[PDB]
Amino acid sequence: HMLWARLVGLARLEARALSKKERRSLLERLKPYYTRIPFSEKADLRLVKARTDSGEYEIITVDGVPCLFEWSDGRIYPTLQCLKAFGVDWLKGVVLVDKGAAIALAKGAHLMIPGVVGVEGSFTRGDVVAALYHETRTPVMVGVAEVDSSALEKLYREKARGRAVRRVHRLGDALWELAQEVGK
């Protein structure tokens, strides 16, 4: 197909079902990093490649929802659309942030410790976590923990300075815009 999205513009799409072998490899690549696989064995998984003016994006869809992507560190991460569809309980943890940090994250900033107001779950430095605006629990960013959850629980209470979560994907980024349109 073809689609036209904000920021990325016109995208030419090529989609196919994942093979039985790719589906198995996908589950094996997700297990080490999340509490559980969020989707069913009956869910239809497809690989969608979108070529835009700047380059190529590949997104794995789950029953048509653009949910997963491979980052430069070789791990598979969820899109925010994935979190809307399946929630966040399957993630090892989440970090709750204040309004100012939710707005900064939606502009593309990393999450600094003073913007944190709560920690949920249990995770260690390097784990995949999501940052949610505390008031509405809206996910605004997906990234990598810079500190263990137990350390963060202490650090945000002291309002220590420093980075809490390194941003990988966030609301309004090019992938998010493309995924929004794929979901339409």
Side-chain angles (χ1 to χ4, degrees), residues 4 6 27 42 51 58 63 68 79 81 86 90 125 166 182:
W4 200 304
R6 183 179 302 285
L27 301 183
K42 296 166 186 175
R51 183 174 59 77
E58 283 190 37
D63 287 331
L68 302 169
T79 52
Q81 288 77 10
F86 296 110
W90 64 281
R125 178 170 204 305
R166 175 171 47 83
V182 166

Side-chain angles (χ1 to χ4, degrees), residues 4-179:
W4 200 304
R6 183 179 302 285
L7 299 196
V8 306
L10 179 70
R12 296 184 187 265
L13 269 40
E14 285 170 297
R16 62 172 180 81
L18 290 195
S19 72
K20 178 177 186 166
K21 180 184 187 183
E22 295 177 312
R23 188 182 185 122
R24 179 168 317 287
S25 166
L26 172 67
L27 301 183
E28 285 277 71
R29 288 171 71 190
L30 299 175
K31 285 172 192 177
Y33 307 112
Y34 301 103
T35 296
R36 68 177 62 91
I37 300 308
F39 58 79
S40 166
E41 304 93 311
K42 296 166 186 175
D44 179 14
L45 266 38
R46 299 173 63 77
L47 184 63
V48 179
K49 300 188 293 180
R51 183 174 59 77
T52 71
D53 289 331
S54 77
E56 299 189 40
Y57 296 76
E58 283 190 37
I59 291 169
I60 289 172
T61 57
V62 178
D63 287 331
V65 180
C67 291
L68 302 169
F69 63 99
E70 175 179 83
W71 185 231
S72 56
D73 57 7
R75 297 198 292 182
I76 301 261
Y77 288 79
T79 52
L80 298 181
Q81 288 77 10
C82 179
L83 302 185
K84 180 165 181 197
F86 296 110
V88 296
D89 286 341
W90 64 281
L91 300 180
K92 282 189 187 303
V94 291
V95 181
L96 303 179
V97 313
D98 64 30
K99 183 183 287 183
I103 290 166
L105 269 42
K107 296 184 172 169
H110 290 109
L111 175 60
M112 314 302 288
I113 294 158
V116 174
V117 300
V119 178
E120 290 178 354
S122 175
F123 52 84
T124 57
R125 178 170 204 305
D127 277 332
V128 174
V129 300
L132 274 57
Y133 170 31
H134 77 97
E135 176 67 43
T136 60
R137 291 188 68 79
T138 297
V140 297
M141 179 264 281
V142 165
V144 180
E146 290 277 341
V147 288
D148 294 351
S149 56
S150 62
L152 186 52
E153 292 269 26
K154 298 175 191 299
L155 296 163
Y156 87 85
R157 281 173 169 93
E158 303 165 355
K159 289 298 176 175
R161 276 51 176 169
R163 189 160 82 201
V165 179
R166 175 171 47 83
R167 173 257 307 119
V168 165
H169 164 58
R170 54 81 179 184
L171 213 178
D173 70 18
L175 172 63
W176 189 81
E177 292 291 358
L178 171 60

